[PDB]
Amino acid sequence: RPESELIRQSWRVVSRSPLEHGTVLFARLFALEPSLLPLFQYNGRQFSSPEDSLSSPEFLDHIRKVMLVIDAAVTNVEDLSSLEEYLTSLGRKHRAVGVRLSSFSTVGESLLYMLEKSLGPDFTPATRTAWSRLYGAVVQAMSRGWDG
Ligand code: HEM
DSSP: OHHHHHHHHHHHHHHTSHHHHHHHHHHHHHHHOGGGGGGOOBTTBOOSSHHHHTTOHHHHHHHHHHHHHHHHHHHTSSOGGGGHHHHHHHHHHHHHHTOOTTHHHHHHHHHHHHHHHHHGGGSOHHHHHHHHHHHHHHHHHHHGGGOO
């Protein structure tokens, strides 16, 4: 695919400093959807403010995990069917903890934002399309964890 190489070359930039980039992703996320803040419950306590999230080791660990799932998607961008089963079960958990499936679209917008900010002019409309397609496939797999 042309798209698969657009993905891999864009991710290259991000994947050298995944926590720094994932921090952008999650800061953007809470800027768009502050109602996601309470869904990260680490030792039964709620972040008050988005900046509170940034001091939580467990929250930063979740950033790393996110960036790793996306890394796996990138690695398997040609054939994503291999992660399908994993992603469904990932979805299963996010239903459990209380994430509306609809909020994963905000994650997608956040991801596109982080890419755009990171790549600037190198984030072409075709790169955006490609990413949107890749991420959309990740979330389609995940959505099965909310069955149907
Ligand atoms: C949309 C908002 C999201 C919220 C509010 C959220 C929240 C959570 C919470 C509360 C957990 C359990 C605690 C933890 O392990 O940190 C979790 C686990 C996880 N999240 Fe998320 N999450 C979101 C999105 C994502 C996305 C987009 C990905 C990956 C693309 C991701 C990957 C993970 C992984 C890998 C785990 C560990 C799951 C396991 O136990 O196997 N999360 N998430």
